[PDB]
């Protein structure tokens, strides 16, 4: 088949900048390069087909350029509408090819996370299993550090996060950490803490209860 | 309108078949080269399989050769794929596409549909178990939503009227094989002795719907 590689992985820009998306075939496919615009819940939409036509409707600020093995959208000036994961495809060669994608992400002014831990509840308590859930809300960038502490002492692979889709009101992120112990392990210690250290914080906020 | 709707999608367990359709309107179905597009839960799109208006030339993926089959109705307007010896790696939402060849060589998918959910599992349909995630200026509630399958589970707040600062997170498979969310929202403080807070699951595939009142 051919590969197709797309770079970079993720491009985090602000609204009215121009964004230079990449797609490098293994071989040829001459002009038979499509581009797709991909946001979460809903379906793929053509952009580009033979390299360089736009489909129909699509704003001018979207150019595509290349010929061969190397391959660029260009998105001049960009729109709040225009942050979205984008695929190129060749269909020049079975098997029809996508390349990865590009994650193309707002950038924002630095938002520091409100932090918030809840305990297991007592109705899952009875079942055996205790989760601990920490809550950190609407921060920028995507980039942050939670680690659990239990009676002080720093945790190793019993926790699992969870992101949001960048709101499309405030463009920040939401994530939440899952610490899970068996009831059993959980009424050995006594405090349960959740550590954040985020570029918005000027040092580590900790939130944490007594059990 | 032009329209492209899928179905047929469900659970069935590895070596079972299953068979989708696509039903187009609003546009000359007959005209067009028709494809199966299939997506992976957190992935990127993958080709299945290619039929040509008048059924006389189809293409097919390297994993799917000899176990799925193309096929269409133009009179009807419709797009099949019979899906045999279904596997865990054939998961994943499906797409019809229409493209806009036509006598040329410009190849570029510009009608989608929204896609119908394939699940090829062992494992058994198990509703969740729903948890409050109690408040301790601003305050945040949550549900917890632990251990079903498949996915999805959808969850909203006061039967929908309350949207505004909620957050309801992309599932997790655990160890288990056993998906969890947490939907979360935070609220003015000033407002937890006087506002309620519900949470609405529903998780279709086991027929489950729980409320969950959630309080301090
Ligand atoms: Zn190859
Ligand atoms: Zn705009
Ligand atoms: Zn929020």
């Known amino acids: 088949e051919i590969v197709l590689t797309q770079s970079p992985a993720t491009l985090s820009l602000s609204p009215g900048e121009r964004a230079t998306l990449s797609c490098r075939a293994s071989?040829?496919?001459?002009?038979?390069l499509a581009w797709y615009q991909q946001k979460p819940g809903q379906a793929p939409r053509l952009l580009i087909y033979?390299?360089?036509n736009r489909a129909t409707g699509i704003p001018a600020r979207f150019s595509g350029s290349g010929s061969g093995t190397d391959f660029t959208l260009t998105i001049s000036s960009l729109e709040p509408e225009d942050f979205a994961v984008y695929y190129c495809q060749q269909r020049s060669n079975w098997p029809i090819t996508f390349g990865q994608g590009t994650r193309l992400e707002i950038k924002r002014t630095v938002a520091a996370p409100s932090v918030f831990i809840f305990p297991p509840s007592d109705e899952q308590l009875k079942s055996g299993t205790a989760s601990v859930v920490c809550l950190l809300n609407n921060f920028y960038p995507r980039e942050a550090k939670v680690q659990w502490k239990v009676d002080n002492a720093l945790q190793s692979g019993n926790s699992q996060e969870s992101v949001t889709e960048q709101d499309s009101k405030d463009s920040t992120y939401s994530l939440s950490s899952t610490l899970t112990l068996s009831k059993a392990d959980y009424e050995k210690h006594k405090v349960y803490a959740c550590e954040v250290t985020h570029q918005g914080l000027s040092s580590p906020v900790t939130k944490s209860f007594n059990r | 309108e032009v329209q492209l709707v899928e179905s047929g999608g469900g659970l069935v367990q590895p070596g079972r078949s299953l068979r989708l359709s696509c039903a187009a309107s609003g546009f000359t179905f007959n005209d067009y080269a028709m494809h199966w597009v299939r997506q992976a839960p957190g992935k990127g799109l993958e080709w299945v399989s290619t039929?040509?208006?008048?059924?006389?030339?189809?293409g097919y993926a390297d994993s799917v050769k000899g176990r799925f089959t193309i096929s269409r109705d133009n009179a009807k307007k419709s797009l099949y794929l019979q899906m045999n010896s279904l596997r865990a790696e054939d998961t994943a939402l499906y797409y019809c596409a229409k493209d806009i060849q036509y006598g040329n060589y410009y190849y570029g998918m510009d009608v989608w549909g929204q896609g119908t959910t394939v699940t090829v599992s062992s494992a058994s349909t198990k509703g969740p178990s729903v948890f409050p995630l109690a408040p301790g200026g601003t305050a945040a509630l949550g549900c917890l939503v632990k251990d079903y399958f498949p996915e999805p589970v959808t969850v909203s707040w006061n039967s929908g009227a309350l949207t505004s600062g909620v957050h309801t997170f992309p599932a997790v498979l655990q160890s288990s094989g056993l998906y969890s969310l947490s939907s979360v929202v935070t609220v003015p403080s000033s407002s937890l002795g006087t506002q309620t807070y519900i949470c609405n699951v529903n998780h279709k595939p086991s027929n489950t719907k729980v409320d969950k009142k959630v309080e301090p």
């Open positions: 033979d390299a360089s």
């Open positions: 039929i040509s208006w008048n059924s006389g030339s189809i």
């Open positions: 071989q040829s496919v001459s002009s038979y």
